[PDB]
């Protein structure tokens, strides 16, 4: 009854500003092609109704579920069908089915214009109206990333306000702002991929997959906490992530604030690093908790072999509650090994399971399971080796060269994937060298497997919507935890039928000359993928010969008196020499 006024309750708990920011984010993520001006109106209508409900909770409609009021507002958008086609059909449904329907139409690759920073323009807008400026920011990010973790987005608006406040008083605005925006953009993209993975886990592997992942991660972060404190927190946190992934953004933010306050209330049982966070206002406090460094491993923890290999009762304990016993193995192993990746720790738990399945049926189980850590070694040696060979390859060739070697690998592994996605994924995979090869020894495996999971999840999300490789389907869907090693093991897809040589990718207009460097590399990388789709067994020398010819040709025509003339009239030679080189 009273708290049937969910909207008043959210408005009271979050305050007007956050309430509006979250409602704006929600409309932007479901209706990614509506203009800001439209969404601002819908936000203001809901905020007014919220204020009415707050003054009187018995006003008509104040008892509806917030997520029902929100859906209803979606359904009352006049251009809903015009713009979102089928999406309109979702309106014929009852909740929760309606929402699930809408969520199905979130577009992970909306291919919205690139937002290129005009420092003076940004600053004029920021000076004119700070609130509108931040609103437009939330809307641009949220419509491009319809799974962006909403409370963090509110945070990135707040944190970066100082940016604009400082920068926009400077005479040289561009020199001040541009580095900061690049940094902002980097934070955003990583935050987006991370949340997109959490929402994919929950949807494709279920809530329990995200819980296991979080047990391992939180046991590393707060290794002094009790198992049951970690599971309480992971459960609350996974609820918050679920609510955010399902578009329940105000309940999401409200739950996260309670979680943040719970963690600060119990900081002494969790981690001494939390002291930093616990006197901050709520968005910042939450952000700081999500980013806290791993606490030190306490002293005097028994060796893992005591409960899990040496003990005579392993089988009985396992048999009485497998899930608890294995959750507990995962907690005990994670808290002791901050230098292992979460996904490696989950692999270790899975193999430990398979071992006791095998061992607990035998005549003498103890003799078999006592040596289990020897059997697990390989799951630690394989990632370290992956890092060692790829980092050496990265440092031998640098980022661009490492990207190209990954283009060659991935195009062979999944040559049916569209060329822009293979390029996009391969360039990100190459950047995992830039982000992780130089890290401390104990951060390298966590850094590498985490970024790999984010980027492979991105390939899985794109592929799930237009499946074209059965091997990608298998590695995306068979096991979240083994995704990375499943992709790692793929070899040249032997069922693939090469395409004819696609010349357009080796033919250009004069405006290639003025492309930003990044775009120029993407041009060469596109060409490289297309070489491999045509001749997947091309040799390193043939690939090198073709690309060198390519760059030499582009240089030559960009030097010409008549650039378009040289590209058009000489262009057939590059095409011919490229084909000659692949013989
Ligand atoms: C209605 C309004 C746009 O006019 O909505 C957006 C607004 C509430 O932005 C919230 C955002 C978190 O505030 C940023 C800080 C720096 O004030
Ligand atoms: C599910 C996982 C493979 O993803 O491996 C099994 C194991 C790690 O389960 C952990 C899970 C969080 O159990 C915790 C229960 C006891 O509270
Ligand atoms: O994902 C988060 O936002 C997050 C938020 C809180 I509060 C605490 C933890 I640990 C988190 O990891
Ligand atoms: O932050 C998480 O909770 C998280 C969850 C999953 I599933 C995968 C990665 I990499 C993560 O960082």
Swiss-Prot record:
Ca(2+) 2 binds at residues 13, 254, 258. The modification Phosphoserine is found at residues 5, 58, 65, 272, 418, 488. Residues 1-185, 186-378, 379-576 form the Albumin domain. It comes from the Eukaryota. It holds the Pfam family Serum_albumin. GO terms for molecular function: enterobactin binding; lipid binding; metal ion binding. The keyword Calcium applies. Binds water, Ca(2+), Na(+), K(+), fatty acids, hormones, bilirubin and drugs. Its main function is the regulation of the colloidal osmotic pressure of blood. Major zinc transporter in plasma, typically binds about 80% of all plasma zinc. Major calcium and magnesium transporter in plasma, binds approximately 45% of circulating calcium and magnesium in plasma. Potentially has more than two calcium-binding sites and might additionally bind calcium in a non-specific manner. Belongs to the ALB/AFP/VDB family. Interacts with FCGRT; this interaction regulates ALB homeostasis. Interacts with TASOR. In plasma, occurs in a covalently-linked complex with chromophore-bound alpha-1-microglobulin; this interaction does not prevent fatty acid binding to ALB. This is Albumin. It comes from Ovis aries.
């Amino acid at each position: 009854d009273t708290h049937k006024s969910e909207i008043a309750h959210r408005f009271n708990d979050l305050g007007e500003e956050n309430f509006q920011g979250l409602v704006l984010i929600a409309f932007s993520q479901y209706l990614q092609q509506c203009p800001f001006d439209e969404h601002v109106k819908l936000v203001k209508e809901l905020t007014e109704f919220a204020k009415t409900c707050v003054a009187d909770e018995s006003h008509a409609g104040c008892d509806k579920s917030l997520h029902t009021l929100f859906g209803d507002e979606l359904c009352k958008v006049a251009t809903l069908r015009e713009t979102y086609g089928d999406m309109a059909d979702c309106c014929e449904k009852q909740e929760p089915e309606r929402n699930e329907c809408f969520l199905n139409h979130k577009d992970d690759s909306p291919d919205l214009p690139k937002l290129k920073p005009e420092p003076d323009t940004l600053c004029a807008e920021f000076k004119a109206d700070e609130k509108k400026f931040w609103g437009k920011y939330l809307y641009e990010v949220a419509r491009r990333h319809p799974y962006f973790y909403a409370p963090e987005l509110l945070y990135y608006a707040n944190k970066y306000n100082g940016v604009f406040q400082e920068c926009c008083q400077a005479e040289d605005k561009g020199a001040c702002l541009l580095p900061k925006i690049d940094a902002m953009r980097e934070k955003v993209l990583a935050s987006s991929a991370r949340q997109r993975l959490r929402c994919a886990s929950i949807q494709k592997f279920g809530e329990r997959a995200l819980k296991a992942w979080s047990v391992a991660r939180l046991s590393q972060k707060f290794p002094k906490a009790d198992f049951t404190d970690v599971t309480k927190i992971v459960t609350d946190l996974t609820k918050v992530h679920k609510e955010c992934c399902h578009g329940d953004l105000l309940e999401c933010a409200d739950d996260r604030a309670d979680l943040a306050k719970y963690i600060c209330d119990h900081q002494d049982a969790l981690s001494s690093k939390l002291k930093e966070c616990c006197d901050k206002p709520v968005l910042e406090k939450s952000h700081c908790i999500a980013e806290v460094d791993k606490d030190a491993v306490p002293e005097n923890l028994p060796p893992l072999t005591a409960d899990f290999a040496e003990d005579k009762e392993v089988c009985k304990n396992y048999q009485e509650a497998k899930d608890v016993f294995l959750g507990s193995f995962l907690y005990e192993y994670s808290r002791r090994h901050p230098e292992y990746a979460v996904s490696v720790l989950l692999r270790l738990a899975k193999e430990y399971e398979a071992t006791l399945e095998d061992c607990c049926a035998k005549e003498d189980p103890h003799a078999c399971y006592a040596t289990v850590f020897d059997k697990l070694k390989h799951l630690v040696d394989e990632p370290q080796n992956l890092i060692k060979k790829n980092c050496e390859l990265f440092e031998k060739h640098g980022e661009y060269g490492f990207q190209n070697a990954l283009i060659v690998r991935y195009t062979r592994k999944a040559p049916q994937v569209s060329t822009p996605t293979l390029v996009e994924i391969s360039r990100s995979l190459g950047k995992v060298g830039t982000k992780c090869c130089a890290k401390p020894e104990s951060e390298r495996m966590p850094c590498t497997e985490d970024y790999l999971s984010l980027i492979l999840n991105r390939l899985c999300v794109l592929h799930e919507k237009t499946p074209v490789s059965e091997k990608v389907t298998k590695c995306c869907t068979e096991s979240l935890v083994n995704r990375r090693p499943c992709f790692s093991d793929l070899t040249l897809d032997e069922t693939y039928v090469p395409k004819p040589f696609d010349e357009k990718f080796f033919t250009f207009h004069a405006d290639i000359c003025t492309l930003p460097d990044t775009e120029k590399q993407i041009k060469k990388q596109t060409a490289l993928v297309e070489l491999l789709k045509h001749k997947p067994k091309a040799t390193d020398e043939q690939l090198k010969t073709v690309m060198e010819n390519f760059v030499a040709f582009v240089d030559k025509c960009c030097a010409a008196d008549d650039k378009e003339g040289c590209f058009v009239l000489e262009g057939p030679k590059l095409v011919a020499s490229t084909q000659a080189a692949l013989a």
